[PDB]
Design a protein around this motif. Sequence first.
Motif, PDB file in Angstrom:
ATOM      1  N   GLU A   5     -68.630 -36.180  15.299  1.00  0.00           N
ATOM      2  CA  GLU A   5     -67.457 -36.072  14.437  1.00  0.00           C
ATOM      3  C   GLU A   5     -67.177 -34.621  14.060  1.00  0.00           C
ATOM      4  O   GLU A   5     -66.028 -34.166  14.129  1.00  0.00           O
ATOM      5  N   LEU A   6     -68.216 -33.880  13.669  1.00  0.00           N
ATOM      6  CA  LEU A   6     -68.040 -32.466  13.356  1.00  0.00           C
ATOM      7  C   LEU A   6     -67.592 -31.686  14.584  1.00  0.00           C
ATOM      8  O   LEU A   6     -66.775 -30.763  14.477  1.00  0.00           O
ATOM      9  N   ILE A   7     -68.118 -32.039  15.758  1.00  0.00           N
ATOM     10  CA  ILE A   7     -67.725 -31.358  16.987  1.00  0.00           C
ATOM     11  C   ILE A   7     -66.242 -31.564  17.261  1.00  0.00           C
ATOM     12  O   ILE A   7     -65.514 -30.614  17.572  1.00  0.00           O
ATOM     13  N   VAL A   8     -65.770 -32.808  17.147  1.00  0.00           N
ATOM     14  CA  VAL A   8     -64.357 -33.093  17.387  1.00  0.00           C
ATOM     15  C   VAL A   8     -63.491 -32.387  16.352  1.00  0.00           C
ATOM     16  O   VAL A   8     -62.434 -31.832  16.680  1.00  0.00           O
ATOM     17  N   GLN A   9     -63.923 -32.401  15.089  1.00  0.00           N
ATOM     18  CA  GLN A   9     -63.165 -31.739  14.034  1.00  0.00           C
ATOM     19  C   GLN A   9     -63.038 -30.244  14.302  1.00  0.00           C
ATOM     20  O   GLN A   9     -61.950 -29.669  14.182  1.00  0.00           O
ATOM     21  N   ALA A  10     -64.143 -29.599  14.679  1.00  0.00           N
ATOM     22  CA  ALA A  10     -64.106 -28.169  14.966  1.00  0.00           C
ATOM     23  C   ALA A  10     -63.256 -27.870  16.195  1.00  0.00           C
ATOM     24  O   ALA A  10     -62.502 -26.889  16.211  1.00  0.00           O
ATOM     25  N   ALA A  11     -63.369 -28.700  17.237  1.00  0.00           N
ATOM     26  CA  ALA A  11     -62.591 -28.477  18.452  1.00  0.00           C
ATOM     27  C   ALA A  11     -61.097 -28.609  18.198  1.00  0.00           C
ATOM     28  O   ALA A  11     -60.311 -27.797  18.698  1.00  0.00           O
ATOM     29  N   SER A  12     -60.687 -29.619  17.427  1.00  0.00           N
ATOM     30  CA  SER A  12     -59.285 -29.737  17.044  1.00  0.00           C
ATOM     31  C   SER A  12     -58.879 -28.628  16.082  1.00  0.00           C
ATOM     32  O   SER A  12     -57.696 -28.280  15.992  1.00  0.00           O
ATOM     33  N   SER A  13     -59.845 -28.070  15.348  1.00  0.00           N
ATOM     34  CA  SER A  13     -59.549 -27.018  14.387  1.00  0.00           C
ATOM     35  C   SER A  13     -59.285 -25.671  15.050  1.00  0.00           C
ATOM     36  O   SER A  13     -58.449 -24.907  14.557  1.00  0.00           O
ATOM     37  N   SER A  14     -59.962 -25.367  16.153  1.00  0.00           N
ATOM     38  CA  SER A  14     -59.819 -24.077  16.815  1.00  0.00           C
ATOM     39  C   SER A  14     -58.634 -24.117  17.770  1.00  0.00           C
ATOM     40  O   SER A  14     -58.383 -25.139  18.418  1.00  0.00           O
ATOM     41  N   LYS A  15     -57.906 -23.001  17.853  1.00  0.00           N
ATOM     42  CA  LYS A  15     -56.680 -22.918  18.638  1.00  0.00           C
ATOM     43  C   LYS A  15     -56.844 -22.056  19.887  1.00  0.00           C
ATOM     44  O   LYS A  15     -55.909 -21.352  20.286  1.00  0.00           O
ATOM     45  N   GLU A  16     -58.012 -22.098  20.518  1.00  0.00           N
ATOM     46  CA  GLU A  16     -58.254 -21.309  21.719  1.00  0.00           C
ATOM     47  C   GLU A  16     -57.475 -21.900  22.888  1.00  0.00           C
ATOM     48  O   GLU A  16     -57.456 -23.121  23.073  1.00  0.00           O
ATOM     49  N   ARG A  17     -56.826 -21.032  23.670  1.00  0.00           N
ATOM     50  CA  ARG A  17     -56.105 -21.495  24.853  1.00  0.00           C
ATOM     51  C   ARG A  17     -57.055 -22.089  25.886  1.00  0.00           C
ATOM     52  O   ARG A  17     -56.756 -23.124  26.493  1.00  0.00           O
ATOM     53  N   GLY A  18     -58.203 -21.444  26.105  1.00  0.00           N
ATOM     54  CA  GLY A  18     -59.157 -21.888  27.106  1.00  0.00           C
ATOM     55  C   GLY A  18     -60.194 -22.886  26.638  1.00  0.00           C
ATOM     56  O   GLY A  18     -60.971 -23.375  27.464  1.00  0.00           O
ATOM     57  N   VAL A  57     -62.859 -32.830  27.255  1.00  0.00           N
ATOM     58  CA  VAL A  57     -62.641 -32.454  28.646  1.00  0.00           C
ATOM     59  C   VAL A  57     -63.153 -31.035  28.840  1.00  0.00           C
ATOM     60  O   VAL A  57     -62.703 -30.106  28.160  1.00  0.00           O
ATOM     61  N   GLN A  58     -64.100 -30.870  29.758  1.00  0.00           N
ATOM     62  CA  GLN A  58     -64.688 -29.562  30.009  1.00  0.00           C
ATOM     63  C   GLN A  58     -63.725 -28.713  30.827  1.00  0.00           C
ATOM     64  O   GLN A  58     -63.232 -29.153  31.871  1.00  0.00           O
ATOM     65  N   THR A  59     -63.460 -27.494  30.359  1.00  0.00           N
ATOM     66  CA  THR A  59     -62.510 -26.608  31.017  1.00  0.00           C
ATOM     67  C   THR A  59     -63.171 -25.489  31.804  1.00  0.00           C
ATOM     68  O   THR A  59     -62.746 -25.204  32.929  1.00  0.00           O
ATOM     69  N   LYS A  60     -64.200 -24.854  31.250  1.00  0.00           N
ATOM     70  CA  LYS A  60     -64.902 -23.778  31.931  1.00  0.00           C
ATOM     71  C   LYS A  60     -66.396 -24.045  31.853  1.00  0.00           C
ATOM     72  O   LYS A  60     -66.864 -24.778  30.979  1.00  0.00           O
ATOM     73  N   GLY A  66     -70.745 -24.682  29.020  1.00  0.00           N
ATOM     74  CA  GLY A  66     -69.371 -24.278  29.225  1.00  0.00           C
ATOM     75  C   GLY A  66     -68.529 -24.400  27.970  1.00  0.00           C
ATOM     76  O   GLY A  66     -69.024 -24.334  26.842  1.00  0.00           O
ATOM     77  N   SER A  67     -67.225 -24.562  28.180  1.00  0.00           N
ATOM     78  CA  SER A  67     -66.260 -24.751  27.105  1.00  0.00           C
ATOM     79  C   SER A  67     -65.549 -26.086  27.278  1.00  0.00           C
ATOM     80  O   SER A  67     -65.384 -26.571  28.401  1.00  0.00           O
ATOM     81  N   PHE A  68     -65.122 -26.677  26.162  1.00  0.00           N
ATOM     82  CA  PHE A  68     -64.539 -28.011  26.160  1.00  0.00           C
ATOM     83  C   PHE A  68     -63.325 -28.055  25.242  1.00  0.00           C
ATOM     84  O   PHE A  68     -63.209 -27.254  24.310  1.00  0.00           O
TER      85      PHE A  68
END
Length: 78
Positions: A5-18, A57-60, A66-68
């Motif tokens: 849950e914290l992971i999803v919250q942080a991922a939706s919180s950050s606005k990184e293009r990649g 979804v893993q991007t790099k 990697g990054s997700f």
Amino acid sequence: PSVSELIVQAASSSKERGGVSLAALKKALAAAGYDVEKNNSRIKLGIKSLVSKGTLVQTKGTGASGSFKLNKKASSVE
DNA sequence: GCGCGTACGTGCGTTTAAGCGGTGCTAGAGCTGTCTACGACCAATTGAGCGGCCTCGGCACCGGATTCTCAGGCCTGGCTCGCGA
């Protein structure tokens, strides 16, 4: 708050293009009051489970290092 | 291989002292002469140390325990994973 849950919250919180990387997610959880050192294996497992479930979804990179990003599509194909 | 962040490179205006020059000095390197203490040379003597012989114990070796460390299996404890309300 569960690790995923914290992971999803942080991922939706950050606005990184990649996307959000392992280091970035670690920094976000550390800023969230989460012990990033004592529970590293749990963070990695949560990340891998979110990737396998299609939530993230893993991007790099490959694997946990990697990054997700958030998958805005699989949230409605349950 | 990837991500981060901070520490090092690059350039510019200011300051600072190196470098050139000149001058003056006088301390001490450098050369010279005298002679005296000091070491080479050589004979005589003897005792210090080198060689061989002997012994005996410090140590090498072995047997035997005693304590230590590495390794690992098992239990306890809590936290997570997951599905429904």
